[PDB]
Design a protein around this motif. Sequence first.
Motif, short mmCIF file in Angstrom:
data_model
loop_
_atom_site.label_atom_id
_atom_site.label_comp_id
_atom_site.label_asym_id
_atom_site.label_seq_id
_atom_site.Cartn_x
_atom_site.Cartn_y
_atom_site.Cartn_z
N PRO A 68 38.20 1.34 -11.42
CA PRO A 68 38.69 0.38 -12.38
C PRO A 68 39.96 0.91 -13.17
O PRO A 68 40.67 1.83 -12.90
N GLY A 69 40.37 0.34 -14.36
CA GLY A 69 41.16 0.62 -15.30
C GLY A 69 42.28 -0.47 -15.29
O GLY A 69 42.67 -1.29 -14.56
N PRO A 70 42.85 -0.30 -16.64
CA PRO A 70 44.14 -1.31 -16.89
C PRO A 70 45.06 -1.34 -15.81
O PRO A 70 45.75 -2.16 -15.69
N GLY A 71 45.36 -0.17 -15.25
CA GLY A 71 46.54 -0.19 -14.12
C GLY A 71 45.85 -0.86 -13.06
O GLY A 71 46.40 -0.48 -11.82
N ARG A 72 45.35 -1.84 -12.99
CA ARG A 72 45.06 -2.53 -11.83
C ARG A 72 45.43 -4.09 -11.89
O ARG A 72 45.69 -4.68 -10.76
N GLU A 73 45.59 -4.79 -12.91
CA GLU A 73 46.01 -6.20 -12.88
C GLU A 73 47.35 -6.38 -13.12
O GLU A 73 48.12 -6.99 -12.20
N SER A 74 47.82 -5.77 -14.18
CA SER A 74 49.58 -6.07 -14.44
C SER A 74 50.11 -5.55 -13.20
O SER A 74 51.25 -6.10 -12.83
N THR A 75 49.77 -4.66 -12.46
CA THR A 75 50.60 -3.99 -11.42
C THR A 75 50.60 -4.92 -10.33
O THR A 75 51.64 -5.22 -9.56
N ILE A 76 49.77 -5.97 -10.23
CA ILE A 76 49.55 -6.89 -9.18
C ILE A 76 50.63 -8.01 -9.54
O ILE A 76 51.30 -8.14 -8.65
N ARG A 77 50.85 -8.59 -10.61
CA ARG A 77 51.77 -9.42 -10.86
C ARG A 77 53.15 -8.73 -10.85
O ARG A 77 54.13 -9.26 -10.34
N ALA A 78 53.26 -7.41 -11.17
CA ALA A 78 54.54 -6.65 -11.24
C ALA A 78 54.93 -6.63 -9.93
O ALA A 78 56.24 -6.74 -9.49
N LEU A 79 54.21 -6.16 -9.07
CA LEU A 79 54.60 -6.06 -7.36
C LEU A 79 54.80 -7.39 -6.94
O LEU A 79 55.92 -7.57 -5.97
N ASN A 80 54.29 -8.31 -7.03
CA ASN A 80 54.33 -9.58 -6.63
C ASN A 80 55.63 -10.24 -7.06
O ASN A 80 56.38 -10.93 -6.15
#
Lengths: 18, 117, 150
Positions: free
Chosen positions: B77-89
Motif C-alpha cells: 500500500p502507500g501514498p506512493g502508489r497512485e500519483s506515480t501511475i499518472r506521473a509515469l503515464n
Amino acid sequence: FYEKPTTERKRAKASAVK
Amino acid sequence: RKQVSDGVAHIHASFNNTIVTITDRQGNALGWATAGGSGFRGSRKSTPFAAQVAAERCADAVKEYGIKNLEVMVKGPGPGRESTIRALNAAGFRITNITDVTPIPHNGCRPPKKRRV
Amino acid sequence: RRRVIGQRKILPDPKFGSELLAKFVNILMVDGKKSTAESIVYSALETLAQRSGKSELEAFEVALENVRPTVEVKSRRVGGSTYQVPVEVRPVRRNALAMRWIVEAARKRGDKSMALRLANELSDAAENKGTAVKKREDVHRMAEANKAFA
RNA sequence: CUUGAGUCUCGUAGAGGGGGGUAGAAUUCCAGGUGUAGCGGUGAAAUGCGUAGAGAUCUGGAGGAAUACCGGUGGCGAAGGCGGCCCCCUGGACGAAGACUGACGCUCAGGUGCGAAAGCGUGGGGAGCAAACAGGAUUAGAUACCCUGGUAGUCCACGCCGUAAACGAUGUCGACUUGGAGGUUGUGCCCUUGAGGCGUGGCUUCCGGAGCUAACGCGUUAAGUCGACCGCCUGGGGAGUACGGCCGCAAGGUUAAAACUCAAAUGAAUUGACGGGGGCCCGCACAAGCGGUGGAGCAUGUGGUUUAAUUCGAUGCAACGCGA
C-alpha cells in the motif's frame, strides 16, 4: 491479537448490527 | 537499445519509500528510480511528490530504450502508489494494465508487534 | 453559513447602460472617491476606447479570457485540521476576483496621474501584459499538481 | 407397574478428540541471471544493511511455523479449548417411529482424572516472533514507550507443574409459569408444485409486562414460583500472608490463621463534569475580501526614570484620547 479479533467481531456486532 | 517497446513496471510501494523498477516479462529489471532516494530523504518529503520525481527520472533513465506501452504492477500500500501511475503515464509512456499484487498471506508467519502508542 | 444572501441588485452603467461596467468602479472605491474617480476612472475608461481604437461596449472583454480563474484556496480546517482543499470557483467570486486582479499595481506607479495610469494597463491585456494577466499564472501552480493532497 | 433412568433398530449435523500423510500462498535463508547507489527507519535519527551488487525483479531450492477466502450475533466440547484438505481409530449429541429392563435415579465431603499461557526436566528442531541482553533516538532523567539486532522461550516426544478476569464474575438436577422476532440442525403432514404453508423436536441470540432485584437488570436458556444434594460468605487492612502438613526436580500450589490498625471499605444509581470522549449546531469565530493599527511624525493616557509632587483609582480577556 489472537484474542481481540474474536472480541471486536463479537463487539462491533454492537456497532454494525443496527 | 534492445527496444522491447513494452514492459512490466514495478511499484514496490512501501510506506517510508516507494522504489520503482522498470522491466519486461522476463524479469530483467533494467532501470529503476527510488522515491525516497530521488535526492529526497526523510518521510513526509519522501511521500508521493517524490514518487513522481522517481517516475520522471526513471522515464529519463530508460528513455534511451524506447518503451511505449507499459504494463505496471504494484507492491504494498502507500501514498506512493497512485500519483506515480499518472506521473509515469504522462511521462512519455502508454499504459497496458495497472494492479497492486501485494502478497496477502494465508496466515503463514508472524510480522512484528510494532508501535503501541 | 446555513443561511444565504442573494447578490445585491445593481443598476446599469449611468453612461454606457451596462451593469458590468457599473460594478467595476465600485471596487476601486477607496476614500469614497467616485466623483474623483469620475476624473480618475471615468476619465480612464473614456480614454480606453480610442486608445484601444474599438467599441468598448462588447469588445471590452477581448482581454479577459486568460484572466478566467478556476480555483482558489478555501480554508477548510475540517475536523480541526487546515487543508489545501481548493474548491472550484463559483460565479460569486470568479468575477469578483477578476476585478480584484486589476489595480493591485496601479496606485503609485510614478506616472502622470492614475486618472490615466489605469488607462495604461487595460489595452496591455489585449496587448498581452498588465496586472490582470499574470494573476492566472500563479493559480495553475497551487492546483492540478498536488493530487496526493489537493 | 411405567411416566423416571438406561439398551437396541434408524438416520442428521458438527473447527469434539487422537494418529497419519498432503497442498499452496507468506516471511526468512541459499544458489542464478539482469543491471543499479542506495536500502531500511521514524514525529526528524543513528545503530543497522550495503558499491563487493544490497534493496527491486523474475528463476529456482531448503526449512519452520500457521492455515487467507467460506466465517457467521456460526458450530462442536464437561471445562481448558477446537478452523486448510484427505484418510484411520474414536467420543458424545439430536431426531423418527417402535421395541425391551423395571426405579436400575439425582447429588456427592474425601477420592480420581482432565487442567489456556507462562515455567521446569531430558533429547531434537528452530522460519518468523521475541522476555533477557546489546546498540540508536527520546526525555530533565529513561533502566520505558520508539528503532536496529536478539537468547531463552514459542514448535515437537516423553515427564512435571497446576494456575487464569479458568467469567454467563450465574453449582448440578428436576417441575411449573404470558408473548415477539431471529439463528442453526432433525423431522411429520400440505398442491412440500416450491422457496415453503401447516406443525413438531433440539440447541441457540435479542427484545419485553407479570414476578423478582438495592439497583442496574434477569425475564420459559430466570437472577420468576418450588424441591434434592453439594461448595462457599460473614467489616476493610494484615492476607490468600506466617507457620505446620501434603504435593512439586525447582519455580511454587493447596490448606490457612493471628497479632496489630481503622470506622469505614463497598455496590446501583442520581445531579454537577473535567477530556489529551464524540457528533452536532450556532456567532468578522474561522473562511473571502475591505479598511486598518503596528512603519514614520504629532496629541493624549498607562508603565517605568527623575523630580517637590510628578496626587488617587483601573491597568488578563472586561485598562492605557479612562475616570478626568
